[PDB]
Design a protein around this ligand. Structure first.
Ligand code: FE
Ligand code: FE
Lengths: 515, 392, 168, 130, 392, 74, 130
């Protein structure tokens, strides 16, 4: 009544509103996903974390305050921004901005999981994931923004959202954790984004990399990236719930193994060579061989704890695994050939392996010295680092019959005459267009689904054009308008200019003209 | 000990720090330290909001404003692009132009909402200790607030889910952020209404915070019939993501939503002695104005006045407004039937009171949205059309 | 061959001049359909403007869409394709088309051609996206039936490629 | 010892590693009963490592291995890893809900969930097992 | 260059870091890592609040609970000690026992208030944009709220300044913190009232936010005559710091303050259509309950039940309560004359409504304070003493 | 009136409140210090930073979050 | 200007030379100085302020300004006054930045310090006496 009431102090915990979320949906005929999917089984699942909006915000904001305290206050007062080894500070231009687009695409894929979820609790989870993926886009951007302010080379930290478009390594990044998520079956994102992408590849990509950063003097990236991954544990919990629903109903389970192998191959095709190259060639101090990192995170832990355990329930070890293990051992060395050979098209300054590096490469990958090692040492002899040399190794590859091809499906470069990783060139003509495919898994994808895979490659866009003109047109220059962002060494002197590139007379060919 | 190497930190280990210092040049290699310096600033100086958000979306030159080139690497079966112009009827010279006037990237967004989250719980712990619920009109509390405010959570929840395809489909970074923050704010509204109900249940024996009655009212009570039909259409009947955002926030929620939240539940709380509900509506109405600021920029500043497609966009926005304003007028006509259930308060619940509340909502909307896209509207005609649903 | 600059070149300029001369909805509609049949998708007639066709398509869409708002009654923008057909009838026709397809090769061409003919602004966006998702559902399901069932050599025969090179 | 980061093949280098890496038996995944948990280093986490996982945690699960990976702790264990935010809040002397424990919990290879104030990462496949 | 050395950091400079590493022992020199491990914990385990606050005050063994020894190094002219037992009539076995149940050291205190600070400005920016002031009863807004709510800021301000001698004189660290946090919360209340008035001034032309009329009413209007007499006495008439805190928070503010803030301005706002004032009273009432938690611990758990001085302390607390409760019922008797100026609302402003409001205030206070110190009070008698000032 | 109002977004900055603080005191006989002093001169001065309680909390909390982030995290 | 150097004047001398001036008869009473000294706590925002405000426009208007690197903070000494506009700083930082946010990292101030709108200044003037 007007006088008597319980005056005990009470609030309402997030758990207490959360148990009512399932009742927030209501039935009407049009209440179903807008996106095409193969998966129509029952998916009325409970989310494993009792997150509501206010608590979502409290949780994430508490993370940010600590992170930005460490960046803007502590590490700035220590001058840590310039305590990074140049190889690694250059590597974070690529890793943070490339990951940034993976995060940005993950917002869109998580919105597809939100849209295709049928249970209100799973819509709740995917909303938080969508927000997290926005958080991670701004975190990756903050890393380069911070480096832009405090690191000795802001060029390329400070404009990658336009300068990435110059080079060929960025094409395949728009697939690996990007188009490959959002351009396809929406509930299949529980498999490609989550069960493969988040459960498998974020761990080396986002966590393991912080040990390499630290080894090389970067305490910025551990501060941000580790925080990023704290959100990932909620993400995969969402996806697992759906994977269970798929596994349990026989009509959906008959798609899961093919979607899993396709997603595994699609992500590892780019991730394996590119991240291994950035780790091992974009560092001075190495933590461990890339192939062991891959063995530990990808093959043994993700492979056994997720896939092998799901084997009890009909999920198969990816048929492409054997081809992938060959990639883990050699493909990043293959890619280094292309990366160093085509250095003017990037936005980072590279460093040929020094004598210490080369011994490490040969100790850990015997045969490196007699193959990759001798090539890099000849390039150095020819003036690879010297802007007056007139030497760019891409022209040298062609003059020795080492053509570079772009995979029509994955966009990953391939040098068949020098590769030790998985691959063989297939060149098909279809309706007057020539196409180069590079492995059994992607070739099947293109043969079955040609209208999904019409990505123009750098040779088709740049055909007949001289290198310095492509670079200038794409704004691949420092603020003086002439000195390249990209460099074949990491020293402060003898930086290459557009005129230095021009003297080499490199003009883009049609690699399939010979077929 | 441990199996793996204890990696030495380059920042602090003497040998690695000395090696690093010898490798780092004594001079900067460029002077341009402004992250993405080439962004065209909306305001007098480039903001951190813009630096962190603008051009994260990797659009090619064939989606207006894109700096990239070439086709996507992988498309849908059939050929649907990862993002494409087919996603909406509206056109522009640059999909990146949009700027939230609150300049919310993720961090300021959760920072502000964290404040509300923690302070809400401190207020509830003290409100329960205060015993201030003792003076609330019990009929309002039990028959109107619990039942019909509870039912309103489903309108907020539907508008929240309307954003799922917008978050996938929309064509730039700042738009995607504006959309998703709006969606969280909508589902927050729904969770906050349910929080208030759960909170009252702890103070009032016999008060049932279950959503069974609110859900029955949302799904079958004629008072919400028009509102639910409109929300279902905006959420699940369309996929043009601009139409969803415009119909959702700029027509339906700015007319029906503002009437229900502000003219009915918030306003009438302060004539029925409800010292609790104003604390919750303060949040939903703050979120409404923050969302309105960003929705207004996208459709008024950017699309309705785009130098090449402004009039073209106003043609569509005029057509959507015509359709969804009719829908919202129908939702309000149904909704004012609720006044036949409330205790009469002169100037609030009689015909003059409801007439003035509809004049504020429709008058405000004419100023805030209709006048800015060239949509003509007779305010009195719309007020009178709703008052036909009012039982004297 | 030698490509011109990426974002500003004679091909794009020449097509903008062609586009500027469209003056009715029917004319721009035949223009965009003919363009899309000739130059887009793997079954296009020509790759001669390959690195420019996507931008050029956007500019035709822009011309057709403004011609729509200038010239058509509002009801037409919502319910009709610029061919004059009823939009709902177009949806029903092509969903039935793809559901009657006997093989993934039949179904894929039905989907691809639907997009060539009715991609917005020809068909209203809401009807197009719903129709396009319905078709993609069918094409995905049939394609993902026994995905690894046909060896590569048979897949290549079925696709009808001319195999120019297979590395040993 | 089997839960060490450099367990098994990870001990080998050069040719010996390559031989086992490319051995036929190792071209398919092998089911593992392990979980892997990564803890972001911080004042609160380091206390949790020293006084919870390496005491009560390892006492209940002797198979847990904690390795120092510079910016984070890498923890592998048979079956499951559990951390009670209520117990952690008692060590830290400050408010500490399960959501606050998650501030610095990153990678989770295994099925992660919360139950009240406890966080668990488990080998069990809930909804499939049991 | 620069004139002085650019000092090399031992954390990062290779040479100095190697020297430091060689000097640091390979093992800890003790295992006790709990800061001030010897504090007796109030709760199951020592809190950071206790570790940071407890025994900061360097009391000697002759101020009960002190761990130091000897006389102060410098005393006042005459011999008054830096701190001393002469500062209060109350005695205890240990001045350090007090624990704020909110466990506020400085950081959580400003953290919470910062949240409220930033969210208030967002709410006002949205409330002004919302236009919700349009439905407030103008008589209430202009003749009652502006004038007498404004005038109440001087009660809050007077109670704030009552704490000045408390912050100097009180005898332990945790007491000093609750005292000072309570003082800031009171001047915040006063500033928030003035903030609300300044805000309405921006929305309502002719509305005067000057404190001239509020000050004239506080200083001369018979409605606040009893109240002003009491805060002047509590603020400037006494220096026993326990008497100030007890009379200030536990008697005067718990009766007059709670009635004016919660029963009059907050409650009546929600019968006169005031959608603005509840947002501000929500803060003052939250602060009241937080302050009450710490005041209750000091006087009930620590002093009224001190194992050796409990009854001795109750003798004084009973004498103070008798005096300042008389002062407060007189303040309330004056204050209920304000009801003669308000628009009549049955159950709120009639005799029955004010009687039930006084039954809540005096009834709640009997439970919250009187019953815990053994102070006898007839609630009905006090209600009737105040109702003698109510004009029918 | 009840239909027309200025709906421009406005708040109240700290200095807007601060300018009225001087007016918060009021005159009464016992309104003087409790402590012994030699210094009895007039001292009606203005403070140089326009700080109110809400703003005080906001600035200090801001400092704290950065400090404790550096300590507890980095 | 060398006279505002931290190691100016007597501070250059060592050993007996320093002792001789330090204990000189004339240096046993204070000497009026027209200088101010301001300490800025190092941070992202302050470091931007130092390089682009006090060392650019600041020293343009006041050439006597000396800025010294003291590891964890900047030491600033100038004749007459030092001035920092929070609005100019916020334009430089592209994020909300009032005079109270500027003061987050403004520490020691030897002189008469005050704020006037968005501007912080420390002056040698004796406000209320001069
Ligand atoms: Fe992410
Ligand atoms: Fe994720």
């Amino acid at each position: 009544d007007a006088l008597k009431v319980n005056r005990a102090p009470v609030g309402v915990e997030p758990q207490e509103v959360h148990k009512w979320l399932q009742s927030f949906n209501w039935d009407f005929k049009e209440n179903r996903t807008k996106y095409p999917t193969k998966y129509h089984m029952a998916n009325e699942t409970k989310e494993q974390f009792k997150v509501i909006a206010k608590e979502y915000a409290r949780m994430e904001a508490a993370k940010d305050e600590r992170q930005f305290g460490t960046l803007l206050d502590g590490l700035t007062r220590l001058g840590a921004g310039n305590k990074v080894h140049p190889r690694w500070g250059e590597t974070m231009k690529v890793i943070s901005n490339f990951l940034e687009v993976g995060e940005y695409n993950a917002i869109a894929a998580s919105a597809m999981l939100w849209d295709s979820a049928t249970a209100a609790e799973q819509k709740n989870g995917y909303l938080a994931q969508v927000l997290d993926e926005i958080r991670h886009t701004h975190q990756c951007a903050f890393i380069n923004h911070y480096y832009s302010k405090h690191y000795h080379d802001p060029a390329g930290h400070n404009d990658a959202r336009r300068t990435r478009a110059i080079g060929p390594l960025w094409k395949g990044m728009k697939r690996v954790f990007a188009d490959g998520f959002i351009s396809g079956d929406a509930v299949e994102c529980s498999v490609n984004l989550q069960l493969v992408g988040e459960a498998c590849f974020t761990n080396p990509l986002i966590v393991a990399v912080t040990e390499w950063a630290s080894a090389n003097g970067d305490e910025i990236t551990p501060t941000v990236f580790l925080s990023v991954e704290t959100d990932e544990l909620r993400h995969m919990a969402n996806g697992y719930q759906t994977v269970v629903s798929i596994a349990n109903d026989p009509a959906s389970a008959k798609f899961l193994n093919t979607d899993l192998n396709n997603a595994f191959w699609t992500q590892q095709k780019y991730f394996t060579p590119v991240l291994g190259y950035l780790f091992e060639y974009g560092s001075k101090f190495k933590v461990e061989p890339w192939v062991k990192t891959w063995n530990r995170w990808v093959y043994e832990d993700w492979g056994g704890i997720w896939i092998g355990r799901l084997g009890k329930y009909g999920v198969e070890s990816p048929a492409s695994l054997r081809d992938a293990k060959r990639d883990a051992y050699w493909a990043h060395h293959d890619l280094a050939l292309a990366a160093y050979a085509m250095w003017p098209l990037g936005f980072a300054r590279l460093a040929l392996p020094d004598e210490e590096d080369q011994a490490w490469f040969e100790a850990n990958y015997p045969g490196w010295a007699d193959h990759y090692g001798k090539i890099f040492n000849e390039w150095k002899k020819l003036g690879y680092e010297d802007p007056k040399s007139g030497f760019i190794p891409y022209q040298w590859l062609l003059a020795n019959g080492h053509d570079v091809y772009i995979d029509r499906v994955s966009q990953v470069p391939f040098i068949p005459s020098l590769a030790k990783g998985t691959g063989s060139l297939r060149v098909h003509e279809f309706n007057g267009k020539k196409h180069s495919l590079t492995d059994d898994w992607g070739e099947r994808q293109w043969l079955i689904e040609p209208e999904r895979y019409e990505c123009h490659n750098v040779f088709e866009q740049y055909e007949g054009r001289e290198l310095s003109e492509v670079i200038a047109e794409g704004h691949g220059v420092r603020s003086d308008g002439k000195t390249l962002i990209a460099q074949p060494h990491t020293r402060g002197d003898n930086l290459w200019t557009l005129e230095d590139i021009k003297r080499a007379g490199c003009v883009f060919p049609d690699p399939l003209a010979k077929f | 000990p441990q199996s793996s190497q204890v990696t030495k930190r380059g920042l602090t280990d003497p040998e690695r720090a000395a090696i690093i210092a010898a490798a780092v040049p004594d001079h900067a290699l460029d002077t341009q330290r402004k992250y993405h310096y080439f962004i065209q600033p909306r305001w007098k100086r480039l903001s951190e909001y813009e630096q962190l958000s603008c051009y994260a979306q990797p659009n090619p030159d064939w989606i207006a404003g894109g700096l990239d080139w070439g086709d996507w690497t992988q498309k849908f079966h059939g050929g649907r692009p990862s993002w494409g112009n087919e996603s909406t009827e509206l056109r522009t010279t640059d999909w990146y132009r949009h700027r939230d006037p609150a300049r919310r990237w993720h961090h300021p967004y959760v920072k502000d909402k964290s404040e509300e989250a923690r302070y809400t719980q401190r207020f509830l712990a003290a409100y329960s200790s205060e015993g201030s619920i003792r003076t609330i009109d019990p009929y309002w509390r039990d028959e109107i607030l619990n039942k019909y405010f509870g039912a309103l959570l489903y309108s907020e929840y539907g508008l929240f889910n309307a954003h799922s395809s917008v978050g996938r489909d929309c064509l730039s970074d700042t738009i995607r952020q504006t959309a998703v923050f709006a969606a969280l704010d909508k589902v927050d509204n729904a969770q906050m209404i349910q929080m208030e109900r759960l909170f009252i249940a702890k103070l009032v024996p016999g008060f049932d915070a279950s959503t069974d009655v609110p859900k029955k009212i949302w799904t079958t009570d004629p008072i919400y019939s028009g509102a639910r039909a409109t929300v279902q259409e905006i959420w699940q009947g369309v996929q043009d993501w601009n139409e969803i955002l415009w119909a959702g926030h700029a027509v339906y929620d700015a007319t029906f939503g503002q009437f229900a939240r502000r003219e009915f539940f918030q306003r009438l709380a302060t004539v029925y002695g409800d010292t609790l509900t104003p604390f919750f509506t303060a949040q939903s109405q703050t979120y409404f104005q923050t969302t309105r600021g960003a929705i207004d920029d996208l459709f008024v500043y950017c699309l309705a006045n785009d130098s090449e497609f402004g009039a073209h966009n106003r043609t569509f926005l005029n057509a959507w407004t015509e359709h969804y304003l009719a829908s919202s007028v129908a939702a309000l006509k149904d909704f004012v039937g609720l006044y036949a259930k409330v205790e009469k308060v002169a100037g609030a619940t009689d015909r003059a009171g409801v007439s003035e509340a509809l004049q504020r909502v429709f008058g405000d909307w004419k100023i805030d949205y209709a006048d800015k896209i060239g949509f003509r509207v007779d305010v009195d005609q719309k007020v009178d059309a709703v008052l036909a649903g009012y039982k004297n | 061959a030698k490509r011109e600059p990426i974002h500003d070149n004679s091909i794009r300029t020449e097509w903008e001049a062609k586009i500027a001369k469209l003056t009715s909805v029917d004319q721009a509609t035949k223009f965009i359909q003919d363009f899309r049949l000739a130059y887009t998708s793997p079954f296009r007639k020509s790759y001669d403007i390959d690195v420019d066709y996507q931008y050029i398509e956007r500019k035709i869409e822009e011309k057709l869409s403004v011609l729509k708002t200038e010239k058509l009654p509002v009801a037409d923008l919502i319910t009709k394709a610029t061919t004059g057909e009823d939009a709902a009838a177009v949806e029903a026709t092509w969903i039935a088309k793809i559901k009657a397809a006997k093989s993934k090769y039949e179904a894929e061409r039905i989907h691809i051609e639907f997009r060539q003919l009715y991609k917005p602004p020809v068909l209203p966006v809401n009807v197009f996206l719903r129709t396009d998702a319905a078709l993609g559902t069918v094409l995905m399901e049939i394609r993902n039936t026994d995905y690894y069932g046909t060896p590569l050599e048979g897949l290549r025969k079925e696709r009808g490629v001319k195999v120019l090179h297979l590395q040993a | 010892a089997h839960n060490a980061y450099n367990a098994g093949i990870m001990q080998k280098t050069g040719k010996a590693f390559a031989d086992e890496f490319f051995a036929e038996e190792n071209q398919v995944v092998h089911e593992s009963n392990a979980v892997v948990l990564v803890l972001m280093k911080s004042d609160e986490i380091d206390a949790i490592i020293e006084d919870i996982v390496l005491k009560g945690g390892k006492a209940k699960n002797p198979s847990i291995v904690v390795e120092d990976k510079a910016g984070f702790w890498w923890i592998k264990a048979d079956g499951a890893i559990e951390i009670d935010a209520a117990e952690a809040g008692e060590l830290l002397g400050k408010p500490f809900s399960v959501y606050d424990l998650l501030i610095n919990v990153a990678s989770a290879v295994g099925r992660a969930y919360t139950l009240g104030t406890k966080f668990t990462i488990t080998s069990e496949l809930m909804g499939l097992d049991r």
